[PDB]
Amino acid sequence: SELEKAVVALIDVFHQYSGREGDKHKLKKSELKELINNELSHFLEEIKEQEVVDKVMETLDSDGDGECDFQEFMAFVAMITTACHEFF
Amino acid sequence: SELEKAVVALIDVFHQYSGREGDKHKLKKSELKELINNELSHFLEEIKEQEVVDKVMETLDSDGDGECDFQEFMAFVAMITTACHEFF
Numbered sequence: 001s002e003l004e005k006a007v008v009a010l011i012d013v014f015h016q017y018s019g020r021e022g023d024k025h026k027l028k029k030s031e032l033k034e035l036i037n038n039e040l041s042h043f044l045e046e047i048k049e050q051e052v053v054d055k056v057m058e059t060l061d062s063d064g065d066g067e068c069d070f071q072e073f074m075a076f077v078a079m080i081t082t083a084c085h086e087f088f
Numbered sequence: 089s090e091l092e093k094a095v096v097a098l099i100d101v102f103h104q105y106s107g108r109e110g111d112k113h114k115l116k117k118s119e120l121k122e123l124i125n126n127e128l129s130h131f132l133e134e135i136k137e138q139e140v141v142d143k144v145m146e147t148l149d150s151d152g153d154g155e156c157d158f159q160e161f162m163a164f165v166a167m168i169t170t171a172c173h174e175f176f
């Protein structure tokens with residue numbers, strides 16, 4: 001179904017980016033920056049300043065280890081999706 | 089991107105099902121049952137008993153109004169996606 005394909009896509013995109021550097025199952029700041037800039041260009045302003053990268057990570061990093069894990073990424077997707085469902 | 093397409097798909101599937109009966113922005117039990125059976129057949133056992141419908145709704149309905157709203161649906165998707173990311 002389209003829903004199953006959506007679930008597969010969320011897993012795949014997280015792993016494409018999380019696997020680049022360091023912990024292969026978490027997004028460091030550089031990985032999260034590239035994910036947003038490359039994959040969310042219709043929904044979010046391009047990130048071009050360290051201050052914005054820092055603030056985004058600070059927001060998403062609920063457990064405070066400085067990285068975005070899969071559960072934190074799902075919370076981010078839920079934010080984006082809700083903002084879209086409510087833009088209209 | 090595939091991520092943007094995934095976000096659009098989550099909004100679309102919720103609205104296809106939520107719009108059938110009653111509140112057009114929430115899933116009642118019958119709507120949630122059909123969503124799971126029709127759209128999540130690879131990830132979840134088909135629901136064939138009232139007891140299972142009831143228990144699923146009870147689990148997803150965080151705010152206790154007896155229906156699944158968009159935020160509760162996103163939490164459900166996060167459950168499914170995490171179970172999949174961890175099946176392997």
Ligand SMILES: [Ca+2]
Nearest residue numbers: 018021023026
């Ligand atoms: Ca990483």
Ligand SMILES: [Ca+2]
Nearest residue numbers: 061063067069
């Ligand atoms: Ca974290």
Ligand SMILES: [Ca+2]
Nearest residue numbers: 106109111114
């Ligand atoms: Ca409804």
Ligand SMILES: [Ca+2]
Nearest residue numbers: 149151155157
């Ligand atoms: Ca509810």
